[PDB]
Design a protein around this ligand. Structure first.
Ligand SMILES: [Zn+2]
Ligand SMILES: [Zn+2]
Lengths: 285, 139, 72
């Protein structure tokens, strides 16, 4: 799974990409591909962190290191363009943090006056503001934000832009319904309330499976009669029904829609709710 | 059908005379014991978990909603209602919305039975002692 | 014989889980993809192919009857 396809929220520090996933996933491996590599600053160390906390927005976890579990540390050679992170045990995660923790930084003569990206005038490295047009030479090339604390950050803390490389993440994972770990009675109460709400939802959908029950019971009766009702050419033609399919017994088509469509959708929803309830019960127990 | 046929207090009293109240109390106790012996199994969730319990408790509440039956069976129902409520309070993992409604109904019935003459009350207190005799939380 | 064979396979009342179109087979709405495969094959063979052939044959028979009537 491409990490980009399952991210719903992302925040950055100068060294970290912090991501909320669309849902909890069981992850066995992480692959990092590195493109457009610049030799001036290359990643030496990647740390992978995770947690399974339900959050509304990932910003709630951005500067909260004590809320993250370290899955793996990996070392890179200079100019390495692919990293395979095999986890010794699969992790269950609704959030990930990828940290570029150390670098093979190649030192250069920053003393030389920088060139203005707008007007090409010479700009002193301190303060890094063009005396001709007022442009800041340390602005992010992508989003124009300026970092006050770090003039040359590895990542833009506003948009995650990196001038030193491009990073693609491929997660060998699978969607897995799960809940946040229970800590103290505060979380115990939260889990119990969540269980009660999910049980109410499960009761509602049960009724849907059972709501289609009499309908299927009835359509099956009609189909068993095997009556040759002559083809009914209804004026409404919104549905793309081919002559052969239109000539199929209406009750047969009605049965196929009711069971394979409606009953299957309701049963899938109920099974998802039942699995999530089982996970919550297991965590509470 | 059964609740419709006994909607009149006439037939409720008739059935109570025949001994329906101990029967429903024993059925409620057996169902609650089955749930207690069932929470030792997996967290297998059942949608219709407690429908029988809720319906039996509703029947008992319907019978109790008649004054004469309440008068004659408070001392005999206090013990089984106390035991059922205490055993339902132990449920944590298998606690279903229907189980919660049943526990609330049992609490209301117990409160309705606590009310009585000091004698009936002291008799209910003696029952409470036996219920505790039958764990630092439940007592 | 084709319809006969389809009827024989249908009367087997056998459940063959919808075979996933690994190849680029014609798209079939899931609603209709869950019918029996033999039911759909029968509907195409008879209502489509047999009906088209019978309509062509009936048109030819009517034209032949008109020609015979004119000749007579
Ligand atoms: Zn400038
Ligand atoms: Zn930026």
């Amino acid at each position: 799974i491409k990490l980009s396809s399952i991210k719903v929220d992302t925040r950055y520090t100068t060294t970290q990409q912090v991501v909320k996933l669309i849902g909890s996933h069981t992850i066995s491996k992480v692959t990092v591909k590195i493109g457009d590599l610049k030799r001036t600053k290359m990643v030496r160390t990647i740390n992978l962190y995770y947690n399974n906390r339900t959050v509304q927005a990932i910003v709630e976890l951005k500067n909260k290191p004590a809320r993250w579990h370290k899955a793996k540390k990996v070392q890179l050679t200079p100019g390495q363009t692919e990293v395979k992170i095999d986890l010794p045990l699969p992790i269950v995660a609704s959030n990930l943090m990828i940290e570029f923790a150390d670098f093979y930084e190649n030192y250069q003569a920053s003393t030389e006056t920088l060139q203005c990206p707008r007007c090409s005038a010479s700009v002193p490295a301190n303060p890094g503001v063009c005396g001709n047009c007022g442009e800041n030479v340390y602005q992010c090339h992508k989003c124009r934000s300026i970092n006050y604390d770090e003039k040359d950050p590895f990542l833009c803390n506003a948009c995650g832009f990196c001038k030193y490389a491009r990073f693609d993440f491929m997660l060998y994972a699978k969607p897995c319904c799960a809940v946040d770990p229970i800590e103290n009675e505060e979380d115990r109460k939260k889990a119990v309330s969540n269980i009660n709400t999910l049980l109410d939802k499960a009761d509602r959908v049960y009724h849907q499976l059972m709501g289609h029950r009499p309908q299927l019971e009835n359509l099956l009766c009609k189909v068993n009669e095997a009556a040759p009702e002559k083809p009914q050419d209804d004026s409404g033609t919104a549905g793309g029904i081919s002559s052969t399919s239109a000539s199929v017994n209406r009750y047969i088509l009605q049965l196929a829609q009711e069971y394979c469509g409606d009953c299957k959708n309701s049963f899938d929803e109920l099974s998802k709710i039942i699995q999530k309830v089982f996970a919550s019960r297991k965590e509470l127990l | 059908l059964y609740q419709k046929l006994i909607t009149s207090a006439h037939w409720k009293v008739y059935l109570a005379a025949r001994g329906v109240l101990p029967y429903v109390g024993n059925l409620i106790t057996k169902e609650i014991a089955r749930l207690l012996a069932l929470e030792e199994a997996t967290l297998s969730t059942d949608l219709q978990q407690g429908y029988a319990l809720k319906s039996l408790t509703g029947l008992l509440s319907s019978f109790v909603e008649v004054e004469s039956i309440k008068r004659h069976f408070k001392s005999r129902l206090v013990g089984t209602v106390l035991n059922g409520y205490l055993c339902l309070r132990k449920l944590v993992v298998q606690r279903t919305k229907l189980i919660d409604e049943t526990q609330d109904m049992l609490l209301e019935m117990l409160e309705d039975m606590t009310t009585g003459t000091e004698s009936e009350t002291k008799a209910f207190m003696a029952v409470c002692i036996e219920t505790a005799k039958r764990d630092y939380r439940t007592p």
